[PDB]
Amino acid sequence: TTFSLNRPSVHFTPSHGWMNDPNGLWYDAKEEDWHLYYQYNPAATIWGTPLYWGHAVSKDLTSWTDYGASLGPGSDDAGAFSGSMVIDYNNTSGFFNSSVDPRQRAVAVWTLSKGPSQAQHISYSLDGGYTFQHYSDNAVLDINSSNFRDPKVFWHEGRWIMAVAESQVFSVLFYSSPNLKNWTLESNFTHHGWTGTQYECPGLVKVPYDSVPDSAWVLFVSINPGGPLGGSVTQYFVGDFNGTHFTPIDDQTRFLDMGKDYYALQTFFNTPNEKDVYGIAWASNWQYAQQAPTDPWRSSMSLVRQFTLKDFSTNPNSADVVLNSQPVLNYDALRKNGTTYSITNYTVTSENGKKIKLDNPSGSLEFHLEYVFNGSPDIKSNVFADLSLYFKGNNDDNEYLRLGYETNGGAFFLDRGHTKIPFVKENLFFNHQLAVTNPVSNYTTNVFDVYGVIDKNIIELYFDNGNVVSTNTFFFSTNNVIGEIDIKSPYDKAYTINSFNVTQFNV
Amino acid sequence: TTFSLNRPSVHFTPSHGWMNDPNGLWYDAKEEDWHLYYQYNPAATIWGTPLYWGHAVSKDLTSWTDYGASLGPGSDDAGAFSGSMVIDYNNTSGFFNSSVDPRQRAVAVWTLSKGPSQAQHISYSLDGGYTFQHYSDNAVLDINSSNFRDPKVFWHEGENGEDGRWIMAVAESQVFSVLFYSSPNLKNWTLESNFTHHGWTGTQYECPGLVKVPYDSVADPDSAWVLFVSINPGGPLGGSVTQYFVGDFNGTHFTPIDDQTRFLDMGKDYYALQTFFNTPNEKDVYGIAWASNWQYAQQAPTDPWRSSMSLVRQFTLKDFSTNPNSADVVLNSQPVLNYDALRKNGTTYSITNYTVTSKKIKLDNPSGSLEFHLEYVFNGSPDIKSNVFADLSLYFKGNNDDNEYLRLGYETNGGAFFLDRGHTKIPFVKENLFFNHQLAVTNPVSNYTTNVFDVYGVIDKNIIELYFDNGNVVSTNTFFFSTNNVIGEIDIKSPYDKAYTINSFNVTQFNV
Numbered sequence A: 001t002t003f004s005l006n007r008p009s010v011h012f013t014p015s016h017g018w019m020n021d022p023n024g025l026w027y028d029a030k031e032e033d034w035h036l037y038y039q040y041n042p043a044a045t046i047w048g049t050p051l052y053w054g055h056a057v058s059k060d061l062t063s064w065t066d067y068g069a070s071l072g073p074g075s076d077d078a079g080a081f082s083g084s085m086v087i088d089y090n091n092t093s094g095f096f097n098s099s100v101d102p103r104q105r106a107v108a109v110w111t112l113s114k115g116p117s118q119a120q121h122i123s124y125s126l127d128g129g130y131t132f133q134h135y136s137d138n139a140v141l142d143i144n145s146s147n148f149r150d151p152k153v154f155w156h157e158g159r160w161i162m163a164v165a166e167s168q169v170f171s172v173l174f175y176s177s178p179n180l181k182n183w184t185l186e187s188n189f190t191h192h193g194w195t196g197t198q199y200e201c202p203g204l205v206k207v208p209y210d211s212v213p214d215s216a217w218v219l220f221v222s223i224n225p226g227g228p229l230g231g232s233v234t235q236y237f238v239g240d241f242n243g244t245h246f247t248p249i250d251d252q253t254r255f256l257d258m259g260k261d262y263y264a265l266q267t268f269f270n271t272p273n274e275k276d277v278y279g280i281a282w283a284s285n286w287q288y289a290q291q292a293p294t295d296p297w298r299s300s301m302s303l304v305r306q307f308t309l310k311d312f313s314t315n316p317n318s319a320d321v322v323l324n325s326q327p328v329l330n331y332d333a334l335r336k337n338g339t340t341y342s343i344t345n346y347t348v349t350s351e352n353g354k355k356i357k358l359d360n361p362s363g364s365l366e367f368h369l370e371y372v373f374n375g376s377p378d379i380k381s382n383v384f385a386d387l388s389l390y391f392k393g394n395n396d397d398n399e400y401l402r403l404g405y406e407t408n409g410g411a412f413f414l415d416r417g418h419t420k421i422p423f424v425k426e427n428l429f430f431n432h433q434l435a436v437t438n439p440v441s442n443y444t445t446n447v448f449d450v451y452g453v454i455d456k457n458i459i460e461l462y463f464d465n466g467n468v469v470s471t472n473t474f475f476f477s478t479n480n481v482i483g484e485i486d487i488k489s490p491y492d493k494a495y496t497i498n499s500f501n502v503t504q505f506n507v
Numbered sequence B: 001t002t003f004s005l006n007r008p009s010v011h012f013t014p015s016h017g018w019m020n021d022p023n024g025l026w027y028d029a030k031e032e033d034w035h036l037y038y039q040y041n042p043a044a045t046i047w048g049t050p051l052y053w054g055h056a057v058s059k060d061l062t063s064w065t066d067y068g069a070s071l072g073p074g075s076d077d078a079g080a081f082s083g084s085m086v087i088d089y090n091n092t093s094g095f096f097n098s099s100v101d102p103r104q105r106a107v108a109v110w111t112l113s114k115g116p117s118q119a120q121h122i123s124y125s126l127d128g129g130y131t132f133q134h135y136s137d138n139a140v141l142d143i144n145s146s147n148f149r150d151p152k153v154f155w156h157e158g159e160n161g162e163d164g165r166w167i168m169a170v171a172e173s174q175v176f177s178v179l180f181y182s183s184p185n186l187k188n189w190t191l192e193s194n195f196t197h198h199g200w201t202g203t204q205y206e207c208p209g210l211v212k213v214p215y216d217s218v219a220d221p222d223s224a225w226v227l228f229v230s231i232n233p234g235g236p237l238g239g240s241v242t243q244y245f246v247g248d249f250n251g252t253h254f255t256p257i258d259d260q261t262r263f264l265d266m267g268k269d270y271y272a273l274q275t276f277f278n279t280p281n282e283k284d285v286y287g288i289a290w291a292s293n294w295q296y297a298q299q300a301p302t303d304p305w306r307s308s309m310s311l312v313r314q315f316t317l318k319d320f321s322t323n324p325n326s327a328d329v330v331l332n333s334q335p336v337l338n339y340d341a342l343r344k345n346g347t348t349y350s351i352t353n354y355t356v357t358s359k360k361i362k363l364d365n366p367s368g369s370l371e372f373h374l375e376y377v378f379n380g381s382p383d384i385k386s387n388v389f390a391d392l393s394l395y396f397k398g399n400n401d402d403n404e405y406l407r408l409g410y411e412t413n414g415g416a417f418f419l420d421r422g423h424t425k426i427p428f429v430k431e432n433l434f435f436n437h438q439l440a441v442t443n444p445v446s447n448y449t450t451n452v453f454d455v456y457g458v459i460d461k462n463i464i465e466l467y468f469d470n471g472n473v474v475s476t477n478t479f480f481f482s483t484n485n486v487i488g489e490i491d492i493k494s495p496y497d498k499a500y501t502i503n504s505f506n507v508t509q510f511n512v
């Protein structure tokens, strides 16, 4: 009842220490292992030097083995700031004698921050990405810059292309290299979208496109500080990449996530089928991430997501384009081992009150919800006319997430202030109220689809099969856990729930 | 305890009924009268039809006389939606005999919304903007659309010997389009360009307006063009929002200088900004906005009026960037009030060289309307690290009940300014979950070697505006105290002593 010592079970967290950004994401196809590195301060639960890349491995992006610090700066003064991994199949670096399986030639491209210089180094691994050896005595790219970070490198066919943030000038620099050693400047993408205070963590990616062409390039650009809710946010651009220059199709601003706690998204260098685009993000915000009431670890990661470009618009009378997000979890094992509750053709009304009590609550559930607004004569514009689901919890049912929809605001809401944890009341950037403008799925029926995941301190809401997504953290009291889901509305028969599956995860 | 009956004193509110976006703003240079029109329902405090244009007049953009319903749709079901006003000096409309002063030849260009149709009509006034007459018993720009609204018109002086034209900016809303039509005579219109899918599209483009704005260049021209586009639904905070683009107008096309997204106001309750057709200086650009959010506006706890307007602001383009290592360009906003009259009819307070340690201000004969200025700086402290809330807060408490208060300040770990507007007894503020309690803005320093933050606030009963870095950043929000409970005391607090230093703090209550 001062800290919130409930730890996620399907979002990766460090065993201990401060975790702050996904790094070196790659997939080892011989061992069938997913590798997730992260910025890590092992000494404490706030950002500090020396900063390493923590390292964790998963068979299924659901269960993580955290091996702790792996890649390091080389002195207490410095940081192994963010960066990426690549698989040098053809041995362009020349680091790899025949004895290293081509599928495991992991080379890491990363920012050294020391004093006033941020410059990019490379370090190859000769043990499948568990330890690393620094290439030479020096960096491979130094521009006498203090803000020069977050290299994300891919193979373009062919050369290596690097995207780096010259953060303070709002620039993604693009650099090419034959061998990962000699880098030459190629184009300077600058002053696009929502600029905030800095550009951080760029990553350029080719993404499938389910039309109604085959693919499209996408540039991710993270922003901190200066995001529209406060602090950090992640935006993206849709366009094409000519080998040197990135050209956005349009002049639109697009956020990946409409919640306050989603930042520093990075994509896996590779996936098993070599087409799908997966990526993960740090699940917090820089305004309050180091004061989060968790111990002995601090930051959490989001779920992995699959990104595909879809034709979509926010109303039925126009045409636009949007990055759909589908969640990647091991749902076979999670749903087999877990207990499901459900509702159908339920017209919400005070007389027929309905609720779901969860047997042996675990704090980790998913749900699909399908609802419609029937309207009522008694609803008009000067009343709050909401369909609320209170996710109440087992030991203190005064701590709850309140989530739902209201006509007169035409939107979905998340209330995350109802908790005894002091932090949520004391830190004034942890907003109680969050909103998302969720489209219907079918404009002749006006059916709303929400799919959500709850894991102890974090909730992710995917609207309209993943066209809109909102990720936020909550903090219940310790060992308080969601055990009752309660359905309410002050207007009888005003709403109707077609479908409402819950599935508690037993973990 | 349920309804917050405190009416704003320097912001415009109708006598009674529901008020919505600003419309037909112009300046009468003959009588020196500012004319404001508003989306209006007099029959209730919620939107409904028939919607009229309410009319207000003011000498100083500070005190307004409300004249009620002036422009109407002519039918019960229908609605007289947003539009703008032009002064047809050289009588290009063919409506004005010479007994009508040129400075007074007022033509309203507005949207008629009736059943499934939304089309642009024009009406005109022969008594300087109080009564109006519809022209032709038909629209002047129809495109059988259901989402075709909010025409904002200005005059484009032709160069070389080309005559010059009226330019209309309209919203083809659902397709995120500002269409630019020209006309010689405000009657026959022709499509010139289709500005589409820019910035923050949200759900709909609404209330567009093209303007040319002075430019204070201190970089490495004289003017630049600005395009205002309002978005609702789909603002990032939820509901409504106003963005702007910076660029050039070549006579048919607006062309932005980048693909940046710039919000005019970072608060939750600043929407549908319209600029005045004309100003006294013929070069300054003034704008007014509707001070609420569509998500909760028709639920606000006020009677017998529902919406308020913001202060008029003076918009000027300056060189600005959010860090000291880059260049960019920003729309600076500068409040426009009758400060001479207000401050001299009113009571001042000061505080200097103050370093915060475990001071309060009692306002004498509280009026509830006040301005304040604040310069502060952060000093550091052994006891402040990344895992604490090290805030400098200012609690504007209430006289009758002081458990209702605004809490605004800065915090170092979040590097940003906050406003907490939840602390009140008014049920609406707890019941409506779209009425955010906590608002934030990433306010810059005003000098990067002194690290001094500058903040100018205006707090009229139930509405607060904040300007940062001399108006490079603005955040506007409504708040609701109990009936007859205006701001009485401001207490300055910080949990870390000597961490912050308030160099200046000039409060000035308005006795209006």
Ligand SMILES: *[C@@H]1O[C@H](CO)[C@@H](O[C@@H]2O[C@H](CO)[C@@H](O)[C@H](O)[C@H]2NC(C)=O)[C@H](O)[C@H]1NC(C)=O
Residues within 6 Å of the ligand: A317, A318, A319, A320, B172, B175, B177, B179, B191, B194, B196
């Ligand atoms: C202005 O441009 C927009 C966007 O290109 C046009 O919008 C299209 O309108 C039709 C209906 O007539 C829709 O079915 C399309 O989906 C819209 N396109 C897009 C991209 O959203 C609009 O018609 C244009 N208006 C004029 C007057 O030219």
Ligand SMILES: *[C@@H]1O[C@H](CO)[C@@H](O[C@@H]2O[C@H](CO)[C@@H](O)[C@H](O)[C@H]2NC(C)=O)[C@H](O)[C@H]1NC(C)=O
Residues within 6 Å of the ligand: A166, A169, A171, A173, A185, A188, A190, B325, B326, B327, B328
């Ligand atoms: C990439 O483009 C940006 C944008 O023009 C360049 O930014 C300038 O950098 C200097 C110092 O390096 C600053 O004083 C200027 O203010 C920056 N300009 C702007 C508009 O912010 C940047 O230098 C370019 N970098 C490379 C490597 O080409």
Ligand SMILES: [Mg+2]
Residues within 6 Å of the ligand: B020, B039, B081, B082
């Ligand atoms: Mg309207």
